[PDB]
Design a protein around this ligand. Structure first.
Ligand code: NAG
Ligand code: NAG
Lengths: 39, 48
């Protein structure tokens, strides 16, 4: 099936910011945030 | 009871139909089933 939904999704080809670590700034939370991490 | 038309009240989802075993691949979070017509097709038994 090809079910179509409406919800808070991360846009495709959207703009995401990459951080490093080596101080832990607070980032705004609005309509949900997306988190990714490879370690 | 399977292979017999019976009114069911599975977790408050009242209705009527015939229940049977399925070969489907319900994910652990899954509880309900549906089709492109958006009607309940399969249900997961809470107690088994
Ligand atoms: C992400 O940021 C860069 C530089 O700030 C910008 O050029 C780019 O357009 C942004 N992404 C999108 C999808 O607009
Ligand atoms: C429901 O409870 C009974 C008795 O406590 C238990 O034997 C059975 O395994 C339970 N069912 C599930 C799906 O946990």
């Amino acid at each position: 099936v090809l079910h179509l939904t409406q919800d808070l999704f991360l846009p495709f080809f959207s703009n995401v910011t990459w951080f490093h670590a080596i101080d832990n700034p607070v980032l705004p939370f609005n309509d949900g945030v997306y988190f990714a991490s490879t370690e | 009871v399977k292979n017999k038309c019976v009114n069911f009240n599975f977790n408050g989802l009242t209705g009527t139909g015939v229940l049977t075993k399925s070969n489907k691949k319900f994910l652990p979070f899954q509880q309900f089933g549906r089709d492109i017509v958006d009607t309940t097709d399969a249900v997961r038994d809470p107690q088994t």
